[PDB]
Ligand binder design. Structure first.
Ligand SMILES: CCCCCCCCCCCCCCCCCC(=O)OC[C@H](COP(=O)([O-])OCC(O)COP(=O)([O-])OC[C@@H](COC(=O)CCCCCCCCCCCCCCCCC)OC(=O)CCCCCCCCCCCCCCCCC)OC(=O)CCCCCCCCCCCCCCCCC
Ligand SMILES: CCCCCCCCCCCCCCCCCC(=O)OC[C@H](COP(=O)([O-])OCC(O)COP(=O)([O-])OC[C@@H](COC(=O)CCCCCCCCCCCCCCCCC)OC(=O)CCCCCCCCCCCCCCCCC)OC(=O)CCCCCCCCCCCCCCCCC
Ligand SMILES: CCCCCCCCCCCCCCCCC[C@@H](O)O[C@H](CO[C@H](O)CCCCCCCCCCCCCCC)COP(=O)(O)OCC[N+](C)(C)C
Ligand SMILES: CCCCCCCCCCCCCCCCCC(=O)OC[C@H](COP(=O)(O)OCCN)OC(=O)CCCCCCCCCCCCCCCCC
Lengths: 121, 174
């Protein structure tokens, strides 16, 4: 449990108020398009299982499938982006607070660095 | 011809002996040369003149792409991806140019051997020395880098060669 028990975490909160400062996913997100595609595939499989015309029957049902998948995908993407932003923020804060653990290393050029040469023959 | 550079592609001056016939028999080679000039050379020359006249009406130009020098891998810092990319690209371009230089020297050698003919072993010794030097330098540069060659591998090889030379010089001076 890495981020479980993180300070200031409200239980059973899908999206806390601090997530409102992040850019919401665009409606043309490729992930949202893929969620809609999954919904359309679910509708097609439903028609195939119930032995209806796969592409023609139940247009309203297929639309409901697509809409539900897009809705859930949008909220899931928001939560995922919030979690990744939180992880990056915590990592940067820890790096800033522990310089003796994360010291900058002096950079030496390849004219100074000696590398062994292994001929290919 | 002006298509190429005479310095880059030398040709010794051509000495053609003058004809000195000693018989009254007609020369079939001369007769056939005259026939060939009458039947082929004039038509092809007229066709080429027409084509070149057509070309001169739509004369346009193309240029030689120029690349500026960039800092090399010796100046690039460790794991600095942008500088390493620039240096690797420059090194690859230099490698291509060196390959073409070796090709030019080889063409010189082949042409000189063919031109000298039966006396190539003596008269081509000048072009053999240049080819020997160029091949030695090219081998010392890119002899055993491998399929995944890189500027870093070439630099490591040069460092190894320099260290070996320094060790040999120190041993000799000791
Ligand atoms: C039917 C559905 C489509 C209908 C037509 C389009 C309707 C929507 C139009 C719209 O809104 O367009 C705006 C939007 C423009 O995008 P954008 O905002 O400009 O892009 C910038 C992004 O911000 C950032 O873009 P990016 O370059 O960073 O890309 C991010 C990418 C980075 O991720 C990657 O690069 C990795 C991608 C692969 C990951 C998984 C690999 C292993 C699994 C393989 C597949 C297994 C199942 C089979 O991550 C993702 O996209 C996450 C999901 C990965 C799959 C995306 C699929 C998109 C199309 C959805 C339908 C696909 C149907 C396929 C089958 C069709 C059969 C008829 O257009 C689309 O999203 C259209 C996508 C293409 C649709 C046609 C199908 C192409 C299938 C290609 C497959 C190979 C790739
Ligand atoms: C379309 C490409 C999709 C690519 C993959 C994507 C993921 C899957 C797609 C989603 C599910 C589709 C529906 C599945 C059931 C289909 C049942 C069927 O018959 O369908 C025929 C159906 C029409 O037939 P029907 O006249 O209504 O009724 C005939 C009866 O169903 C006839 O029934 P029956 O009693 O004759 O059935 C007998 C047949 C029944 O066989 C089936 O039902 C086979 C299909 C179901 C098997 C599983 C499908 C995949 C489910 C997900 C699994 C992973 C997929 C990815 C895997 C990658 C690695 C392989 O059984 C056999 O043949 C048994 C021997 C063969 C078994 C071994 C082979 C199994 C292959 C399994 C994997 C297949 C992957 C691709 C599937 C593509 C299906 C279209 O055609 C379609 O469903 C076509 C696809 C939908 C087209 C939509 C077009 C929309 C308008 C244009 C859009 C243009 C682009 C958008 C942008 C705008 C541009 C302007
Ligand atoms: C103020 C008035 C307005 C309030 C607004 C509502 C506020 C939120 C209310 C939420 C509904 C009431 C609670 C109902 C149950 C809550 C369940 C969920 O919402 O809670 C979150 C949980 O979220 C869900 O778990 C995320 C669901 C994600 C589903 C997909 C998982 C990823 C699958 C990977 C492939 C995905 C493929 C595509 C799938 C569609 C966080 O709970 P948490 O206390 O912290 O859990 C602690 C235990 N842990 C840490 C071990 C987990
Ligand atoms: C009818 C049969 C069922 C299939 C229905 C297909 C359409 C479903 C969506 C209806 C329209 C919804 C809508 O208005 O979406 C708009 C939204 C993008 O809008 P927005 O981002 O604000 O504008 C662009 C700004 N740059 O769009 C989005 O956010 C896209 C979300 C959905 C992505 C769906 C991807 C395609 C799925 C397969 C469609 C196949 C259709 C086949 C029809 C066959 C008919 C016989």
């Amino acid at each position: 449990t890495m981020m479980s028990g993180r300070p200031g975490r409200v239980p059973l909160q899908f999206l806390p108020n601090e997530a409102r400062s992040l850019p919401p996913p665009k409606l043309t997100d490729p992930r949202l398009v893929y969620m809609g595609f999954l919904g359309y595939c679910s509708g097609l499989i439903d028609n195939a299982i119930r032995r209806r015309p796969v592409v023609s029957a139940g247009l309203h049902r297929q639309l409901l499938y697509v809409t539900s998948f897009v809705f859930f995908g949008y909220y899931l993407l928001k939560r995922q982006d919030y979690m990744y932003a939180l992880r990056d923020h915590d990592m940067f804060a820890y790096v800033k607070s522990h310089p003796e653990d994360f010291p900058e290393k002096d950079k030496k050029t390849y004219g100074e660095i000696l590398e062994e040469f292994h001929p290919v023959r | 011809p002006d298509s190429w550079d005479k310095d880059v592609y030398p040709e010794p001056p051509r000495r053609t002996p003058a004809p000195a016939p000693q018989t009254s028999l007609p020369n079939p080679v001369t007769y056939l040369t005259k026939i060939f000039d009458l039947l082929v050379d004039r038509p092809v020359t007229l066709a080429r003149e027409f084509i070149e006249q057509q070309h001169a009406k739509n004369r346009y130009y193309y240029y030689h792409r120029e690349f500026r020098r960039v800092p090399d891998i010796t100046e690039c810092e460790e794991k600095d991806i942008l500088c390493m990319f620039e240096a690797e690209m420059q090194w690859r371009r230099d490698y291509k140019v060196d390959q073409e230089i070796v090709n030019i020297i080889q063409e010189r050698l082949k042409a000189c051997q063919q031109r000298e003919g039966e006396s190539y072993r003596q008269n081509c010794a000048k072009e053999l020395e240049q080819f020997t030097q160029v091949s030695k330098a090219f081998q010392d540069r890119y002899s055993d880098l491998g399929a995944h060659y890189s500027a870093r591998k070439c630099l490591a090889k040069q460092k190894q060669r320099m260290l070996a030379e320094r060790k040999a010089a120190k041993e000799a001076a000791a």
